[PDB]
């Protein structure tokens, strides 16, 4: 659990943003203590209107591409795993399905040569992911099992670094903000991202006091 006490903007007290280290696969939680900045602005405390944004300052674009498929409930799904890795040189391909990131409601019989079948669990309707790894390059393959009527939507191919939809909470009684910061298993060690946080206060009458800060996520292997 990370903890950052924000600067209270009084004209008083290397890089600009604070430091956040991350490991490919983890899902951690962050706490920020807006107390030093919101307490003097005596009003109705904080309001749950925080806004996040993630930008990449060093990306190293992914070698292997992601993909997507579909199948009806109960029906097995077969697919390829070779047309996703355009290799520049000529070499061999040691496909692998990471056990720590296998599917969650099925079984995958990884064939010998970029082939696999996906048996979905009995009476299961939803989306299901598993993270292959070609020659060490990690990418996800999303399968959506449909409930045999029409279809389900096409999920958005989770980013290397993300903040989940709604797991944030703000305690107006102690001026503390919490959220979750998850890192895909496809993050590449050494890359650096930047998370900017726009948190809004409120006065007794209903106006706004905005506050912006940033954080520098550094994707490091072995913590």
């Amino acid at each position: 659990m990370y903890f950052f006490s924000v600067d209270p903007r009084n004209g008083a007290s290397s890089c600009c943003c604070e430091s956040i280290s991350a490991r490919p696969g983890e899902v951690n939680g962050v706490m920020v203590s807006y107390a030093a900045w919101s307490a003097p602005l005596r009003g109705h405390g904080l309001t749950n209107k925080t806004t996040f944004e993630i930008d990449g300052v060093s990306v190293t674009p992914p070698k292997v591409s992601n993909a997507f498929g579909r199948t009806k409930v109960g029906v097995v799904f077969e697919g390829t795993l070779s047309d996703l890795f355009p290799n520049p040189e000529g070499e061999q391909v040691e496909y692998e399905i990471s056990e720590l990131n296998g599917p969650s409601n099925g079984v995958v019989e990884l064939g010998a040569n970029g082939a696999f079948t996906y048996t979905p669990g009995a009476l299961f309707t939803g989306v299901d992911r598993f993270w292959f790894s070609i020659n060490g390059n990690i990418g996800e393959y999303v399968i959506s099992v449909d409930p045999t009527t029409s279809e389900l939507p096409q999920p958005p191919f989770t980013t290397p670094v993300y903040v989940p939809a709604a797991r944030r909470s703000v305690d107006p009684r102690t001026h503390v903000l919490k959220f979750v910061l998850g890192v895909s298993p496809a993050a590449i060690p050494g890359d650096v991202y930047r998370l900017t946080v726009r948190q809004v206060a409120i006065d007794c009458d209903g106006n706004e006091f905005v506050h912006i800060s940033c954080y520098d996520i550094s994707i490091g292997s072995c913590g």
Partner: peptide
């Protein structure tokens, strides 16, 4: 100088 403190 000019430090700010939040303390119980």
């Amino acid at each position: 100088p000019e430090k700010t403190i939040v303390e119980p």
